[PDB]
């Protein structure tokens, strides 16, 4: 039985470029986490308590995704390489602008997964494409959800009254089309 790079028994070797792509993607998930933390703080500073609670939870969820990926590398007997994490953006001129960054962050997270997916397909790594499939499925829902929150905030057209209503929706857990 062969030994994998992390020292565990190796079911099948992984291409080093694919390994690097997964390690980099873990950093994307972690960066999404700290970005949602920054967004939760921005919302709390403006008394948007529902948005604060929503993004506080999204930050924890993105961290969970990152750990899920680290567990996949363990399962494949590959080394993890936890990287330096950049500071998040922390300033926005409006909630609409913040929600635009959040949507783009979600879409960028999917693009990163898609790039790993294509690399796995090029290397005939079916374990990895199967691993990523439910994560892309979840990204579709997250993109649908963030398009909903962004579009609803934009519909408010900067009216504080409408933003307070939406803020209360989020505090109540009404965060998608349903």
For the annotated binding site, the residues are: 29, 62, 65, 106, 133
Residue 96 interacting entry, from Fe ion, its own copies, Cl ion, none, C-beta within 5 to 8 Å by type: Cl ion
Written as six digits, the tokens of 12 are 């099948």
Alpha-carbon distance of 66 to 26, in angstroms, equals: 5
Nearer to Fe ion (CB atom), residue 60 or residue 177: 60
Nearer to its own copies (CB atom), residue 15 or residue 171: 171
Question: Phi, psi (5° rounding) for residue 89?
Answer: -60, 145
Task: Kindly report the number of other CB atoms within 10 A of residue 40's CB atom.
Answer: 20
Q: Does 8 bind its own copies (CB under 8 A)?
A: yes
* Identified binder of its own copies from the candidate list 13, 24, 57, 156, rule CB under 8 A: 156
Find, among 116, 118, 86, 92, the residue nearest to 104 by Cα.
Answer: 92
Footprint of Cl ion on residues 92-131 (CB under 5 A)? 94-96
CB-based contact 131:116 (threshold 8 Å): no
Nearer to its own copies (CB atom), residue 24 or residue 169: 169
Residue 93 interacting entry, from its own copies, Cl ion, Fe ion, none, C-beta within 5 to 8 Å by type: none
Find, among 95, 86, 111, the residue nearest to 33 by Cα.
Answer: 86
Residue 69 interacting entry, from its own copies, Cl ion, Fe ion, none, C-beta within 5 to 8 Å by type: none
Q: Does 147 bind Cl ion (CB under 5 A)?
A: no
CB-based contact 120:18 (threshold 8 Å): yes
Residues that bind Cl ion (CB under 5 A): 94-96, 158
């Amino acid at each position: 039985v062969a030994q994998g790079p992390n020292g565990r028994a190796l079911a099948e070797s992984m291409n080093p470029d694919l390994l690097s792509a997964i390690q980099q993607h873990i950093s994307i998930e972690r960066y999404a986490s700290v970005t949602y933390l920054a967004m939760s703080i921005w919302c709390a500073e403006r008394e948007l308590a529902g948005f604060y609670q929503f993004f506080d939870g999204e930050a924890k969820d993105e961290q969970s995704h990152a750990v899920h990926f680290t567990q996949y590398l363990i399962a494949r007997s590959q080394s993890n390489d936890l990287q330096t994490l950049d500071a998040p953006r922390q300033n926005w001129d409006s909630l609409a602008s913040l929600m635009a960054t959040a949507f783009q962050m979600e879409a960028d997270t999917t693009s990163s997964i898609q790039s790993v997916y294509a690399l796995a397909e090029r290397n005939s790594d079916t374990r990895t494409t199967v691993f990523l499939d439910p994560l892309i499925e979840a990204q579709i829902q997250s993109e649908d959800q963030f398009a909903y929150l962004l579009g609803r905030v934009k519909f408010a057209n900067g009216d504080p009254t409408a933003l307070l209503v939406i803020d209360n929706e989020l505090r109540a857990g009404q965060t998608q089309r349903g």
